[PDB]
Write a protein that binds this ligand. Structure first.
Ligand SMILES: [Fe+3]
Ligand SMILES: [Fe+3]
Ligand SMILES: [Fe+3]
Ligand SMILES: [Fe+3]
Ligand SMILES: [Hg+2]
Ligand SMILES: [Hg+2]
Ligand SMILES: [Hg+2]
Ligand SMILES: [Hg+2]
Ligand SMILES: [Hg+2]
Ligand SMILES: [Hg+2]
Ligand SMILES: [Hg+2]
Ligand SMILES: [Hg+2]
Lengths: 307, 307, 307, 307
């Protein structure tokens, strides 16, 4: 079934010390997260660049890693029920907070952790180039050759287009119908590895280190080994849901060229352009498209998805 | 069905500033072109070199990019009807002309834009290496394994042999029959990714910036933001059709070695050599073979082709 | 009388080895050509640049020799009858072919050798600065001071504007009348050293190394000392004549500034601009203007011209 | 059917000038060779190294290209009948000799051109990685999945083990039976791309530049453009056949590691070792194994083979 998605967003210094701390702390955070039976996996992204749309963002490019002074991370964790995410944080607060605190010296912005429901998903399981033979064999054996997926390689060997949209209040349904039609047509593009639409349902105060006065002081005054009061979060997930409604259109591609011209199909192919125009008419903001590298992931979330 | 092909040809300075302007302007031109419902896609080529034919052109080689002071571009746009191309230019003149003008500082020759009908096509859809599993699965599911194409990777991950021919008046049919037989046999060569024969039907004056006196002065005197009178083109497409008849034999290959020895098959394999000799007997000019890299493309033109 | 003109065109690597082979082979080719009594001289050009027309060809300039990776040559040979050119090639094939073959290692494109009739000529004999005193003295002695020509120095000490035009079918007469009027007025410009209009009547297959299948294989397989069958040319000169009709407007100037502003007179002097506009209205292609340096020449062709 | 094989062997200076002359002359020679209807293709090899057999040849290694002062070439040409090879040389002597003469400045040893019959062949057609999808599709379509070959990439993208053997007179049959059994078992090794056994039937004097006194003087005294008397070869092909009998065991592999451990299977796998021991017992000389790179080839010889 469709899991809920929590996305922890942050901006840190782009220097080796930052990536060294990803390697030490990241695995720990994920392992603590896996303590909860509602946890169904994760997909961690590093932003490598921005889609320039010609020169609409002429100062940007798809790979800005060599020039950029900061690095932005977007950590997806997948949950049977979004409430599981909230429960996980509170049950494992002592570990989580102290782990995330060691990121402090590198933090510029964040963490900010919106929660999303998936209202549309066309996402295959990941496979390495070594696996396709067995996958093909098995699917033919069981008479389901139509279930043979594209090869979507895990661990930094494909790229993601992360497309931000905010929609005019009252136009949500028009956006949702048009985006689904758009993605259903978009899957014909070469190198297309899947897509899903995320609809924000709220924000996790605890995951965003957003407490009341008490917790705020505890955060600011912390030596690193004392938890803020996890009950000092002053709002529930839904209370923080944004209006205008926010969506993420998440599309995966074989490489940055397939991404560039693939996403471009909604602009270059007249038939698809007409359909995608219905999406554009509903927007307050966007589309703004970040290029992401899914470096670290628990691929089994797609197994939960496709069962 | 078979679309018509417009090929915008130009020669520019081989320097970074030239490629920077491709990235800013190219996408825009393509997007304006897609405004017309007759537009069915594009395939943009950079010439990387010339086929030396041993040492017949001993100063040349397949990859001359590192030494060359100029770059030649050949932009294919595909059209349901060639008249659509002409209509598109005129309907969107304000945008098109001002966009193509920003190429000015880099121009050495061109633009020159002949129009072609396709009289023969054996061209598959493009696919990335990640797609073949799903393509195989789908074709077997629908009982059409014979429709499984070779893997013809988009976005600069294959090469094109662009073979110029002009034919002795009265020998057109002999050329056309012999070239089709040749290409039907040539498809056995390893790394063969498809072929098509383009027959020139005329030239687009408006696409070639070839106006009467009035438009010419407007072009030369332009600050960049004023259009020449698009009605000052003094000839129709067919009026500019060349005699001797011109053809392009367009053949795609996995790599430059497969191209070199593949094209060479018409010279090295006695059986095919005899057939290809019938082509040679009809020529006023050629064969002259440019090596092209199809870097930017709207792959969906092949979908229109193969329906 | 007016001779016919054969122009051998080729593009070679711009490196010392190329010019070294000009000095060894060129003289030989010219000496073999002089075996035929119909040969009345030659004028060999190196292209040094392209007229930018402001920034219409902004990447170009009049002298591109220092930056260019290639060099283009245009070798005019002059003939009492164009048939003499064809006869010369065949009578001296063994020498000619083997000589032109040694250019192989430097060839990028060509050779291509169109033939032209001169439909208008205002071209003086060449003289060195040392000669004018005797020329003046002689002309006054014989009572013909009006026959004292401008000083048109031979051997790379002046420059040529080589203006390509292709004309809309049915507009040839309008072009020819308007171009003659244009050149008759243009001769008032400072530094004007003469002009002529060349009208293509066909192409020499043998001079262009364009044979049937048999000759083509012989060319490609040649060790350098075996002639292709000179009777394997499959078309006559006129059979290759182009439609749209092609013309060369050949204008000579004291220097590149006199050329730039001189040619510019058809754009800058209202009276002449009106007349030249009639030329512009007839064009399919052009004007495209190459800057040439006439380095090596047999000046006596002008003696034949002006008798 | 099984073609006959001529192998032109030579040793030249390992310097750029040598490879430059391969690119100019090689294509010509192969094109002249293709004049004969008995010509069914070629496979040209550069020796990159020697199989060291542990340290039996401790001074050698599989890739010696960076250190070696010479380069050895082995050019296979394939023929319907070995007599076709002899006829081809004589019919095209003037071209062939003059072409092969330009190699002179680089020659250290050779040319030497033994002729061979194929007494065993397990060799697939070549295919590029882009082709396998269509090959798979076609073979399943025609109900022959057993005829789907390994992917044996052409043009320098695989390697060859060239194993020299000479056999004790009277032991030929034992050698032939044991080598076939060996190769039938060897095909199980990973990366195995095919094998064949060549049995020498003679030597081509004309291909080896081995004439009588008259031809020898003509060779030594040649300016480069005069043929030795091709009728001055003093022996027929079979008259030069060697005793002890010579064989080449030609095995192709995905890469040098697969080659090393693959060939090693006859030494490391007890079962296969016992069988291969029967080969060893028959030998006067060998096995001596050269590592070859098949850079230039006419892949269609395998099409003739497998029909
Ligand atoms: Fe969280
Ligand atoms: Fe156009
Ligand atoms: Fe000539
Ligand atoms: Fe031979
Ligand atoms: Hg993690
Ligand atoms: Hg943090
Ligand atoms: Hg484009
Ligand atoms: Hg332009
Ligand atoms: Hg000369
Ligand atoms: Hg030449
Ligand atoms: Hg060859
Ligand atoms: Hg030789």
């Amino acid at each position: 079934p469709k899991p809920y998605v929590a996305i922890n967003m942050a901006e840190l210094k782009n220097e080796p010390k930052t990536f060294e701390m990803f390697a030490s702390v990241g695995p720990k955070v994920c392992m603590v997260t896996a303590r909860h039976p509602g946890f169904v996996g994760f997909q961690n992204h590093i932003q490598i660049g921005i889609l320039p749309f010609g020169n609409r963002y002429g100062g940007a490019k798809m790979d800005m890693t060599k020039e950029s002074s900061t690095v932005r991370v977007l950590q997806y964790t997948f949950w049977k029920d979004w409430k599981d995410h909230e429960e996980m944080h509170r049950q494992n607060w002592s570990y989580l907070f102290r782990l995330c605190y060691s990121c402090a010296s590198q933090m510029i912005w964040g963490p900010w952790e919106p929660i999303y429901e998936i209202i549309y998903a066309n996402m295959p399981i990941n496979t390495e180039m070594t696996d396709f033979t067995a996958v093909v064999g098995k699917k033919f054996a069981e008479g389901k050759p139509l279930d043979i997926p594209v090869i979507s390689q895990p661990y930094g060997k494909r790229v993601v287009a992360f497309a931000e949209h905010s929609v005019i209040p009252g136009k949500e349904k028009q956006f949702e119908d048009a985006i689904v039609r758009t993605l259903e047509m978009l899957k014909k593009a070469p190198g297309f590895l899947g897509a899903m639409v995320l609809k924000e349902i709220g924000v996790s105060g605890i995951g965003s280190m957003q407490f009341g006065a008490k917790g705020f002081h505890q955060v600011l005054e912390n030596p690193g080994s004392l938890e803020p009061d996890p009950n000092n979060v002053m709002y529930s997930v839904p209370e923080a849901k944004n209006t205008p409604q926010q969506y993420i259109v998440h599309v995966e591609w074989a490489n940055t060229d397939a991404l560039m011209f693939g996403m471009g199909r909604v602009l270059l192919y007249p038939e698809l352009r007409q359909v995608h125009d219905e999406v554009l008419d509903t927007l307050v903001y966007g589309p703004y498209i970040r290029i992401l590298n899914p470096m670290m992931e628990g691929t089994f979330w797609r197994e939960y998805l496709n069962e």
